[PDB]
Structures are given as structure tokens and as C-alpha cells.
Symmetry: D2
Subunit: 399 residues, 4 copies
């Protein structure tokens, strides 16, 4: 059949769009038909002219990453580096449309390299899901909380949770009561995957098992916002979520002077009064930094991460202090307790994003040490954030 | 030739060639030099990017764009572009749009409009910073600061000042309209000239940083939640019991119970400031990427309180509202200057400046975002309530 | 113990009437001769109901002025609770000297605060400024639709809309002068934060009366508006809230002082460098790691609470009144002197009304020279008290911080 | 004579220098009177006939008298099948009356039930290592079962009630914040937990000599300052209480309806507190009740800052959904029945009134737990009454 004939068929059969994929056979043609169909529903039918769609691998997207596809959005990818981190050198891909961001981050990388590099450590690793359940009375929910805190109750819960996956290993439970409601924060490792779907599956089976001991328990929602996913929350800041990371470096006074165009003293004064006092006056929870979100977002988009997780992933406290023999060298550290990231699944299944992951040497699963690729990616993110903090802070300090 | 050049858009001719060479140079520094093969770069207009949106360019990252709609908002119909890699997001949001359309559509209102910049300055003593604060709060002091701020642009118009003291430090939050631009650069230029003028009245004042994190830009902050930043928007709709039953697969009562206990109580137990919603960030992020917005601003732009109530003659219909006090957005400048993103903006009829009434396109885009968020909230909440 | 019909005197007989006619114990001072035997009977009625009838033995009740407490400060009175009052000072503030009364049961608190005052005095004193003054009340109202509540918000934001509201608000008292309106929307709900001066009074009752009259006026223009609650927690009163921290509530105050290196060494037993490092890592970084909003200090609450109890303030207001950011930095020719400042944006306080009407608390207020209304300049006594509180807090911060810096 | 003693001084060593306590106070008062802009201002500040024996060198210094706070009683509070007569020290008119009305509605509803969910006072010191890599190593060390046991042994060796439970650590570059949590019998426990923290830190220092103990309290406890950590992880006693008020009682005692109360609770205590940017303040006036009971019972009133954290929830229940279900959850009630101001006779009297004075001989900590339950129950009574008044107008 012809395009116009498919169009007539879809319009004359009230067959909702998007079903084009199962209707036709080729992937790009279904996309071309949906764009044509959509075009007649717009005040400017030619508005899709510059929205590219051709020569793109839609097989990996369909049934996995997006629906009602009408094309793709190209985000410029720049590179910042080398980032000298833990005695290795990384060339960091950054997808952004903000001018000077890559340049500024690159300058930061330069100052770190000339300073002998940066060191980083993964402090914790565990994705979470925090469902909300209800009991008839608060006295009952209290009983469930006490039961879940015994070694016997936990083991049975861990047992049912762990049985849904090879990588699902329940670490701990933080429960919280609000009258007859009970919020249960399940935390578990997830190999190299960010882990949402995996932890969710585990949580559902665990809640099913919990319901066998407490038949009167009502499962209100698999997510009761106690995770907390994609919303700002003190719980992620205080207890961590995903990967908690810290990185540090010392920048020689000469480098601060020549590369950063400022002094260690001026940098410290700006850090304390902007990142600590300013954030405090603004009523911030977890936003004790200059622009971690810029770096997190740019790397996330380039590497197939869930960019909406930039909300909590960007949590960061940037600290600066005088170091060295004469207290003229700049010590800097960035602590990020909740980097939600992965190197397998979701958008990391797509080839262009796998390319950016390969650039860093962390694409896909780490066979001999599950989770190591994801941990390495989190360290790179924390290191690039520190590079970004150094540069922007120097620019603010200099004027 | 592609060889002894190693021995770029500033030197060479073609833009696409400079990228090829940059990719070649970078290739030699990679553990897996072949990785760059699946990273696209050809047939892309780098002219608009170079010197404006990105540096050290090695290609571009394609983000699948799906469409959700029609979104029946304020008696208009919108086809919403969403750039995402999260499966079922577009489908779920589309389902939400469906429920709203069958309910007679959604209504929205822009409550406030004003981008901010909050520099930190210091005086010798707290007694001096207090004097500067008092002067900034007089009608004459504001008038002179406003005269100086507004002289930097045709679109920059200072609306108000909120000053806060921390001993000898003084944080000044400048809030101004910025036409159809998100306004960061414009407001920053205005802030610098205003601070310069302030310095003439108080020579002992030290300008510590043009941004003292009191804006607050790209970090979570109660100040953006309470006072707004960019566009403050509210939207609402009533979904008929039958639609909740047939499209959403649940009941009004179940939806309400989930909203209260998840979006209100749950977020409260989590210690959230501004995160009284299910997944506004998913919608904000997807639209932001497709429309050339600054995706990092998703941090504060996603602030939202979702409310659900029993409505109608028999209290069986679902009333829903989403209030978003800090949508940082624009239809001119930055990534909106690129053609593919302009295409998504054109889809919504808000591309570029609204020559007649500067700001209307940006205000319309903020209303669409708030409306799409409500569609997304409706669908995901129904799915959680139904199990 | 005469029968009931005969009883028109005698404790045992009153008790029999109370039990038999089931007339409540609070109706006692309204039926009994003196205030004192009225509570006596009450304690006796209560004592019978306890698992240990002797419990009240050491709870004082005699020789106390209940006339001022009745129908004003407390109900079902069974006595009074004595809180030890100590004095810290002199506090050299704004070229004046204050002897600060502190009611507390925490050992070493007055001593430590006194040491702080000493370091300040030897440093040339402290300076303070009142940055803002205005008590608030934040009611919640509802409109049928969010589009309507948005309309009310815009109306309240026009110059004419504000004038009619202000006119209504101000007609309730000579001191009620509406300053501004902060309005916030949540769907069809509308939260309105009314802010106004209140002379020397803390102002809750006054601002509330003004808010009710203003809401009725608003109701005339928007008849479909439902007044859900005179307080929708948007004030915010007695609960932690970022809004009080960011916009202030009551009196916003800042105080500062410079402590000479020698004084930090000899009086505080530490160095300026050590103090600064503890302040930054405890009051800034530590509070940040703890997820604090407004708690960037060491123990402002100890000082605020002690002064509030001694001066008849509402001690429950210690929740927001204690908000404070303490900052320390190197000062002087050789950067060896300690610069310190305390910023408190929401001190809820008053020198007239409530517990300040009682004699013992008026005594503590008199000690500071701020008791009652300031005839010549309304509000000045309350402002002076707020400055004293901020200054005493700084004295307390200096001493405790030095003790943390020095020992361990 | 007072006159000659005064000329001698021309100091705050009065109690030691002389003999009788009351006279010491008398003399300090006379000396202070000459420094005041108004010499007779102390006239109505009482000071006579007071057992300063227990106060001198334990509860207050430079004593010049005492401040009388009116004590009222609210009750009976029907809680967990028991009846309590609750002492409330306040100067706020109608507070006791309103709280009493709340108690009445609860009693007529069949009483309230409560549960202690957690119990453990905390202290959060801040230490520093040369590098973030070192602090990370200490964090990992503290997380192993062996490293924990060693710290726990040193902590528990300091006192009879020092049982170190979970250990929460947090890193900020080279800084390390360690939240020590432990039971403390019937004592509020700050002094005890502090003593335990110091020995534990010395033991930790033996394994990590490069570690600098910056401050025994790094504000990570967190004591007397608002903090999300206390709300989320609890501090002291975490308690929950609940009750169901029959429609008729809501109508006759509270002068309103269940529907009206629910609408006010949701829009004020949840939405309003959310719009205000509150962390832990999802209630109407828990602080009023916490403060009044704390003052009357010798607690540390400054701890009302975190002790008043509370989320009040209301729901329609019953056959026709006209009855009122109510719950109050308070995760951080810092309280005790031994030590500090509870050592004073008048406050012990108020504690006795509740049957929780001093140590619980048979079951250590039970008196303090009982007092926390009473506080949470009285808060719920206060929430019910004020909410009804706001609902009614
Ligand atoms: C490119 C970017 C990092 C940048 C620079 C810079 O580093 N230029 C650069 C280019 C090449 C090499 C090295 C550096 C300067 C920048 C800052 C000072 C001086 C010069 C450039 C700014 C910027 C930040 C706040 C302003 F008000 C104005 C501009 N910005 C914008 C950052 C913005 O997104 C987030 C910010 O708003 C968060 C905050 O601080 O609250
Ligand atoms: C696609 C997406 C919106 C979705 C659905 C859904 O609506 N499916 C859909 C598809 C087609 C038509 C209609 C609906 C369900 C979803 C939820 C319940 C039942 C079925 C699907 C979920 C999801 C959310 C939380 C979970 F624990 C597990 C899955 N998710 C993932 C949401 C995630 O990003 C953010 C979330 O974590 C934030 C939160 O709530 O804390
Ligand atoms: C008396 C009090 C202020 C004090 C001192 C002191 O200054 N002693 C004093 C006596 C005489 C003269 C001069 C000084 C020391 C104190 C501190 C260090 C060294 C000596 C005394 C402490 C104290 C604070 C935290 C601890 F872990 C232990 C004790 N405390 C208890 C304060 C407490 O309530 C609030 C606190 O918990 C808030 C915080 O910091 O988190
Ligand atoms: C006595 C007190 C509990 C009270 C009542 C009341 O219950 N009266 C009472 C007396 C006897 C029997 C039964 C009831 C009413 C009250 C409320 C409504 C109607 C009647 C009385 C109020 C009060 C609270 C906020 C206002 F704006 C005005 C008044 N207040 C003052 C409470 C105040 O401290 C804390 C409050 O500000 C916190 C908040 O809600 O934000
Ligand atoms: N309607 C409009 N609204 C805003 N800016 C406009 C408009 N029309 C043209 N402009 C131009 O675009 C600029 C804003 O874009 P840009 O310089 O990239 O800064 P920003 O970071 O604020 O977006 C304005 O300074 C002005 O020169
Ligand atoms: N019991 C106390 N009452 C009041 N102030 C005290 C008390 N103990 C100490 N101080 C305060 O602490 C400071 C330290 O004095 P002191 O304890 O005698 O030690 P030092 O001799 O080392 O100065 C004094 O300036 C005083 O203000
Ligand atoms: N200088 C003053 N400042 C404040 N109130 C004053 C003053 N002089 C007299 N008053 C009166 O005292 C009262 C303040 O006390 P009160 O009614 O208990 O309310 P609040 O809760 O504000 O203390 C008001 O009625 C007011 O008329
Ligand atoms: N002075 C008071 N002391 C104690 N409780 C009081 C007082 N006034 C009112 N109440 C409470 O209010 C309830 C009844 O209120 P209401 O019907 O207004 O009558 P009244 O105020 O005359 O007691 C009583 O059961 C009691 O709990
Ligand atoms: N049941 C008990 N609970 C608590 N402390 C007890 C008990 N029995 C005896 N004690 C003693 O009381 C001490 C606690 O009082 P105190 O030192 O004043 O500190 P705090 O007031 O900070 O709790 C314990 O160290 C112990 O010696």
C-alpha cells in the first residue's frame, strides 16, 4: 500500500495512531506516517521540517525507550578532559546546549591535572524504593515495624526480595510510621544497572510475602514517595540513594593563579559565603554547591542515564580550604550522596549513548566484578563535578 | 588534508570537517578508539552551535522524541513533544491527556513571572549591611537600582528586591521579567550594573560573587518554592467518574487516598521541600530536552504540589490541580536557537519571540508544561492506585 | 460534715457538694471566697484521683497572686512551678549595660553565658540592629476553582485591592498597621500571610482580630470564598518553617562584636583560628549535613528559652524564635582577633500582654528596662528586648563554641 | 551583717563565701539592685522559702530567685486503658481549657492507644582526617562488625546504661560526622551519651592516630536546632498515638463535624505546612503541649525545638464515615524522669502526679517511655480541640 492509502485507512477506521509499528513492518516508515498524520493537526504543518527522523535505529527504541515516535532531538556533545582521577585519565562526554559549559569544565580538568590529579571513593551503593502500606490501626503498623526490625522478619523479607533477581541483594530496611501508615524503604545493590525496575520487582514480591504474615495490611502504592525518586528529599541527602561518592584534589597556588586567574584565599571566601551561607539563607537541603546539576545533566544525557534523576543526583556539598606549607594551596572536595546511575538498561541500550559510555570504558556489565562499571561512572561524575565547581568558583571569585 | 592538520572552526573551512578532525585527535587518547563510530556527527548544522551552545564538539546525541496529546488546555489543543529514553513515559502521559480531554479540558493561569539572580556582597560591619538593606527598601533606593538595572536591556524590567542579611554579608535577590527569554544572561547583566551603581552609594561594599546562591539557580531551595522563580503556574481539571473508571482503571476514592498518602504524607515523611508530586520531573525533563530548554533547571522547575479532591453532585468525579511556582523557561535564546528544538517549539506554536506581547510565548510554554505535568500525574497516580 | 441541702463553709463540705452536684472543679474560684482556697479545694479533689494521693505535697500554691492568672493566663490551676532565675552580665550592647535574667534548670548555662558576656565587654561591646518588625497570621481560604483563587491573588496584588484590605485590617486597633501581603496558591486554596506591627505586644491576638475583619471585607468582593481556617499554618506559628527563616516573623535582628586575641586566649581558653574552624564545620557544614533549615548555630534555643521563661514570653515560640545563623571570622591588623555575628530573623516577642502581665515576670522585664508599653515610642521596648536576646545569644554562642574548640 | 558583707565584695561566689543559700541569694539581689536603672525592679521577683540546696551547682548559677509559672491540669487523659491527670505549666490563656476539652472528647470515644517505636538519645561529633580517602576508610572501618564492636565496647564501658546501638556516619570531604545512638535508662541522656562518645572517640583514635576530634558535637545529633535528621531517623523517643471520636462527640463536645475537621487538617497541617516549607511541622500546636508539660515536669524546655516534631492525621471512619479517626506521630521526644530539673521537688511532684517520677526499678527506661506516651497523647488531645475550634470558627 501507499502512504496516502495508509493515511486514509487510519483516518477512516478510527484506528488510533501509534499502532503504526505493529501495523506496518519497517520502523522508519511508521515514524514517517505518524509525522504526516500529526502535521495535519498543527497550526503550522511544516513545523516538523527540521525535526530529524531518518537513518536512526528505531528497533532499540520501540518497545523499550519511547512511544509515538516522530523523530529524534540532537544534543551537541562536547568533550572535557583529560580528567585525572584515581591515577587514570578520562575523556568526559558532555551533551549540552549551554555555551561555555564544556570550556569551563575543561579548564577545571586542567587545573586538577596540573595539581597531581584527583582521588575518589564510593562510600555506599544501593538503589531504593519506598512503598506505603496501611494497617487498620497505628498499633498494628507499629507491630509490623517491630516485626520487620527483628533478624527473623528481615531474613524472610530479604529471601522473598532476593528471589526475583540475580543482582537483587537487599541491604537494609528503614521504616517510618505516620499513624496507621507505614513507609518501608527497601535498599539494594543492582549490579551495573541503575536498578529501578529490579528493586521494584523485588519490593512487590517482598510486600506480597509481608502480606502473608499480616493479611490485614493494605498495599496502598508500590511507591509512597519515601524512596525518594525524582523529587527533592532530605532522606536521599541523609541516607544516600544509589551511589554515595566523595572526591578531592589539591591545586597548587601557582595553578590557581595561572589557570584559574584568582587566589586560594578568594576561592575559599566565595565558597563559604555562596555554597555554605548563601545556600543556607536560601533554605537549601542538599544544594551546597555552585552548579553540580550542569555537569550531572550533561553527562547523563550523553551517557543514556535518566536525566530526570538529575533532581537528586545533583545533591552535593563543595568544600574548599587552605592547604600546603604556606597555606597557599587550594584543597577541594565534593561529596555527592545520591548519584542514581547505571551502565546497563534503559537509554544505555542505545548505540550512540553506548559510544559515550565506551569512551569512558564503562559500557555495559562488568562480568568479573558486577557493579564496577556503574561505580566507576559515579566516580567520574563526582570528579567532573569537582572540575566544574573549581572553574565556575574561580570565575565568580575573579570577576 | 585530513592528516598534517594534526601537525578548528577558526582555522579550517568546513564545520563538519573540524569535528571529524577533533574526533580523530580524541581517538588517539581513548582506550577504545572505535567507540566513536556509533556517535553521530555528520549532516548537522554546527553553525548555530559553534560559539553559542557547546565547545570541543565531537558529534551529537540523539534523544527519541515522542508525542503526547491532544492536551486540551484553556480551550486549545496541544500536541506535546517529549524527548525521553524512559519506556512507557510518553504512553502514560498520553493516557493522562486522554482522561483530561474526555473531562472537558484543563484550565491554567500564570500567577507570577520573573527570573532572579541573588548576588552576595559584604560590608565592613553588620551595622553597615543593615544600612544598605534599609536603603534598598526605600522607594528612592529601589527606583535608582531599577533605573540602573533596566538601562541594560529593552526586556529587563526589575520588579522587586528581597534582601537578606547574614551578619556583614547581604544577599540581594533581583527579580525581573525578561520577555520570552529564560533570562539568566539578561538578568546577570542587569544585576552587575545595579551592583556597580549600589557601590557608588556605598564605596566600602565588596561584591563577593554575582551569584551568592540566593537566586537560587539549579540547586534545591525553599526560597524558589516560597517566592517563585521564573513562572509560577497553576492548572486544574475535573475527571468524570466514568472516565476515571474506563480510561484510568480505578476510582476517584482510590486516587485521592493515594495522592494524600504518597504526595502529601509520604513526601512529608521524606523531608521534602517542594516535592509534593509523583513525577513532575519526568514531564519537565522530557519537554525541556525536546524544546531546547536548560535541562539542568529541572531541579527547581519540577517543584510541584499535586492535589486531588472528590467533586460533582455525588462526589464521584475527580478534581485535580498542579501548582508549580518555579518553572524556569524560555522560547528565545540558548538551545531554542537550534533548528530541531525550534521545530518542537513550533509544534506548540510558541517558537521565538512574541513580537506583540514579549513573554507570551514563554508564558504559554509554562502553561503547557504545567498541564502536561498534571496529565502525567493523573496517569501514574491511577496506575499506582490500581496496582 | 453537714448534709447537702443545708450547705448554702468547710472544705470537706465543699468537696461533698462538688461530687454530689457534679459541678466541675474549674467553677471553684467563682463559687469559693478566696482564690487560694479555691485551688486548695481543687488540689484536694485531684489528690483523691491519683495513684499516689501525696503527689502534690511539694507542689507550691500558697502566697501567690492568682487574680492576674485567672481568666487570663491559665485554667484548672493547682499551683505554680518555680524555675530558678540566674543572672548573666553585664551585657555591653549598643553602649548600654544589661543584666540578663535567665530562668533555667540546666547547670552551667548561666555561667557559660556570663563568660560570653565577659569576653564581649572586654572587647569593647556589641552592636545590634533591628532589620524588620512584624508579626504574622497566615489563614487558608478556598475558592471553587484555581482560576478563581488566582483572580483573588491578583486582586490582592493591585494597589486598590490592598488599600481596602489594609483599611479593614487597621480599623481593629490603634497599633494594627498592615505592612504587606505574601499570597500563595495551591490549586483552589489560597494562603494569605498578613504582616503587621503591634506596638510592644507580641501581637498574635491583635493580628488575628485584624485578619478576621480583613477576610470578611475580602468576602464582600468574593462571596464564593470559603474561609477554611484563620490559621492555615502559613504564618507560621510554633512549627519549624522555611517561610519564617526567609521572610522573617516578629523581629529580625543582627548583632556583632570583635573579641581581641588576648581575650579569646585568656577568657575563652582557645584561639581565633580554632573557634573559626569549629564554627564553619559545626554550625555551617554540620547543620547542612543534618538537613537543617534555620539551625546554623550552637545553642541559641538555650538562651532564647531561658530569657523567654523569665520574662513572661510564650516559651513555645522558642521553635521559630531560636532560628539563627552564627558566623565567625578573622579580624584585625594581624588577623588574630575574632569577629562574630548572630542573625536571628524571627524573634517573636513582646513586653505587654500574656505572661508579661504577671508581677514576677514584669520584675525581670524591669531589670532590663523594657517592661510594658513605651509611651513615647510604641514598640521600642519590644525591639529593645529582641536586641538583648540576640546579644545574649551571641554571648552564649561565643562561650559554648570556645568550650567545644578547646576541650576535645 | 548584709551591709558589711556587701562592702567587702564592694563576685559570684556568694554561696561558698557565706553559709545559708537564701541569704546568698538575698545578698546577690541587693548588689544587683544598685546596678539597675530602676533599683526596685526585683521587688516582685520571689526568692524566699525555696530549696536552693538541689539548685546550687546543679541547675542554675548566680541565682537571684525563682520564676513562678502557673500550673493547670488537663484530664483525665484516657490512654492505654489508664487515666492520667496532666500537669501543664503555662501563661497562655485557654490552653489548659482547650487541651482539657480534647481529653474529654477522647474519653467519651473509648480512649487512646499509643506505642513507643524507638528509643535512643544521640550525640553527633565531627572529626577530621588528612584526606577524604582517609575519612572514607574510617567510615568503612566503623561499618564492619569488628570495628563496631570495638567502638561499642569503649562506649558501653563508660556507664551502666550505655548500650550503643546503630551507628550513622556521614562524610563531607575530609570531615566525618558520627551519630552515636544509645538508650539511657530513664534519663534524657545527653550527659551520659556524651561521656560514652568521648571514650569511643579515644578508642577510635588509637586505630586512626591522624584523626582530629574537632568537636564532641558537630550539630549532627542534632540537639536543640531544627533538623531533618531527627525527623527521619528519630531522636530520644519515637511515639505514635491514635483514637476514634464518635460523630456525636465531635458534634457535642467539639462543636463541628468529622468532615470539617478532616478538611482543615489536610489543608492546614499538610498543605499549609508544605507551602510554608516545613520539615517536621505537620501539626497545629504540638509545641504548646510539649512546652507546658516540659516546664511542669523538669524537662529541658529548649528541647521543645525538636521534641515538638509531629504529623497529625485525620480520617473519616465508621459505618457511615462520620466518625473521626486521629493519629499523632512524634519521632523525636527528648525526655527523662531522672536528672537535671527532675531532681527538684516541685517538678518531681508533677512527675509523681503521672506516676513516672525517678527511675523505674524493675524495668529501666519505662518511666521515661511512659512520660513520652503521655506527651504524645496530650498533644493529640490538644490537636483535636484546636482543630475543632478552627473548623468551627
Ligand atoms: C559556563 C558557566 C559554567 C558559567 C561561567 C563560566 O564558567 N565561564 C567560563 C568560560 C570559559 C572558561 C571558564 C569559565 C560563568 C561566569 C561567572 C563569572 C565570570 C565569568 C563567567 C557563569 C555565570 C554564573 C553566574 C552569573 F551570574 C553569570 C555568569 N556561568 C553560568 C553558570 C550557570 O549555568 C549556573 C549558575 O547560575 C549557578 C550559580 O552560580 O548560582
Ligand atoms: C511510565 C511511568 C510513568 C511509570 C508507570 C506508568 O505510568 N505506566 C503506564 C504505562 C502505560 C499506560 C499507563 C501507565 C508506572 C506504574 C506504576 C504502577 C503500576 C503500573 C505502572 C511506574 C512505576 C512507578 C513506581 C514503581 F515502583 C514501579 C513502576 N512508572 C515509572 C515512574 C518513575 O519514572 C518515577 C517514579 O518512581 C516516581 C514515584 O512514583 O516515586
Ligand atoms: C553549659 C552548656 C552551654 C554546655 C557547655 C559549656 O559551655 N560549659 C561551660 C561551663 C562553665 C563555663 C563555661 C562553659 C558544654 C561544654 C562543651 C565542651 C567542653 C566543656 C563544656 C556543653 C556540652 C556540649 C556538647 C557536648 F557534647 C557536651 C557538653 N554544654 C551543653 C549545651 C547543650 O545544652 C546544647 C548542645 O547540646 C548543642 C550542641 O552543641 O549540639
Ligand atoms: C487556647 C488556644 C489553644 C487557641 C484556641 C482554642 O483552642 N480555644 C479554645 C478555648 C476553650 C475551649 C476550646 C478552645 C484558638 C481558637 C481558634 C479558633 C476559634 C476559637 C479559638 C486559638 C487561635 C488560633 C489561631 C488563631 F488565628 C486565632 C485563635 N488558640 C491559640 C493557639 C496558638 O497558641 C497556636 C496557633 O497559633 C498555631 C496555629 O494554629 O497556627
Ligand atoms: N521577545 C524577546 N524576549 C526576550 N529576549 C528577546 C526577545 N526578542 C529578542 N530578544 C533578544 O534575546 C536576548 C535574550 O537571549 P540571550 O542573550 O541568549 O540570554 P538568556 O540567557 O537570558 O536567554 C535579549 O537580550 C534580546 O537581545
Ligand atoms: N559559677 C559561675 N557563675 C557565674 N559565672 C561563672 C561561673 N563560673 C564561671 N563563670 C564565668 O566563666 C569565666 C571564667 O572564670 P573562672 O571559672 O574563674 O576561670 P578562670 O580563672 O580560668 O578565668 C568568668 O569570667 C565568669 O564570667
Ligand atoms: N505600646 C503598646 N503596644 C502594644 N499593645 C499595647 C500598647 N499599649 C497598649 N496596648 C494594648 O494591649 C493589648 C495587647 O495585648 P493582648 O491583647 O494580650 O494581645 P497580644 O497577643 O498581641 O499580646 C492590645 O489590646 C493593645 O490595645
Ligand atoms: N475553665 C476551664 N477549665 C477546664 N476545662 C474547660 C474550661 N472551660 C472549658 N473547658 C472544657 O470545655 C468543655 C465544655 O466547653 P463548653 O461547652 O464551651 O462549656 P464551658 O466553657 O462552660 O465548660 C469542658 O468539658 C472542658 O473540657
Ligand atoms: N533507671 C535509671 N535511668 C537513668 N539513670 C539512672 C537510673 N538509675 C540510676 N541512674 C543514674 O542517673 C544518671 C543520669 O543522670 P544525669 O547524669 O543527671 O544525666 P542526664 O540528665 O543528661 O540524663 C545515670 O548515669 C546513672 O548514674
Amino acid at each position: 500500500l501507499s502512504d496516502a492509502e495508509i493515511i486514509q485507512l487510519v483516518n477512516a477506521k478510527h484506528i488510533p495512531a501509534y499502532k503504526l509499528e505493529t501495523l506496518i513492518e519497517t520502523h522508519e516508515r511508521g515514524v514517517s506516517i505518524r509525522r504526516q498524520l500529526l502535521s495535519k493537526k498543527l497550526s503550522e504543518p511544516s513545523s516538523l521540517q527540521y525535526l530529524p527522523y531518518r537513518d536512526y535505529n528505531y528497533s532499540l527504541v520501540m518497545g523499550a525507550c519511547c512511544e509515538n515516535v516522530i523523530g529524534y532531538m540532537p544534543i551537541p556533545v562536547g568533550v572535557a578532559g583529560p580528567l585525572c582521577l584515581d591515577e587514570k585519565e578520562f575523556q568526559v562526554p558532555m551533551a549540552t546546549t549551554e555555551g561555555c559549559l564544556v570550556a569551563s569544565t575543561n579548564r577545571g580538568c586542567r587545573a586538577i591535572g596540573l595539581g597531581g590529579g584527583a582521588s575518589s571513593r564510593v562510600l555506599a551503593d544501593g538503589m531504593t524504593r519506598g512503598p506505603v502500606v496501611r494497617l487498620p490501626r497505628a498499633c498494628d503498623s507499629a507491630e509490623v515495624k517491630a516485626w520487620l526490625e527483628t533478624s527473623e522478619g528481615f531474613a524472610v523479607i530479604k529471601e522473598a526480595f532476593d528471589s526475583t533477581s540475580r543482582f537483587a541483594r537487599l541491604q537494609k530496611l528503614h521504616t517510618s510510621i505516620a499513624g496507621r501508615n507505614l513507609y518501608i524503604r527497601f535498599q539494594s545493590r543492582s549490579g551495573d544497572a541503575m536498578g529501578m525496575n529490579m528493586i521494584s520487582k523485588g519490593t512487590e514480591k517482598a510486600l506480597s510475602k509481608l502480606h502473608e504474615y499480616f493479611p490485614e495490611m493494605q498495599i496502598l502504592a508500590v511507591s509512597g514517595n519515601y524512596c525518594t525518586d525524582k523529587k527533592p528529599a532530605a532522606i536521599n541527602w541523609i541516607e544516600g540513594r544509589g551511589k554515595s561518592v566523595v572526591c578531592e584534589a589539591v591545586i597548587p597556588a601557582k595553578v590557581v593563579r595561572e589557570v584559574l586567574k584568582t587566589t586560594t584565599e578568594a576561592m575559599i571566601e566565595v565558597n563559604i559565603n555562596k555554597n555554605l551561607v548563601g545556600s543556607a539563607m536560601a533554605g537549601s537541603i542538599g544544594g551546597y554547591n555552585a552548579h553540580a546539576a550542569n555537569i550531572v545533566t550533561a553527562i547523563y544525557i550523553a551517557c543514556g542515564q535518566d536525566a530526570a534523576q538529575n533532581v537528586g543526583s545533583s545533591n552535593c556539598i563543595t568544600l574548599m580550604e587552605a592547604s600546603g606549607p604556606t597555606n597557599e594551596d587550594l584543597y577541594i572536595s565534593c561529596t555527592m550522596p545520591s548519584i542514581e546511575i547505571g551502565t546497563v538498561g534503559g537509554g544505555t541500550n542505545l548505540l550512540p549513548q553506548q559510544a559515550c559510555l565506551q569512551m569512558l570504558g564503562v559500557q555495559g556489565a562488568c562480568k568479573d566484578n558486577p557493579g564496577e562499571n556503574a561505580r566507576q561512572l559515579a566516580r567520574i561524575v563526582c570528579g567532573t563535578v569537582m572540575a566544574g565547581e573549581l572553574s565556575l568558583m574561580a570565575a565568580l571569585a575573579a570577576g
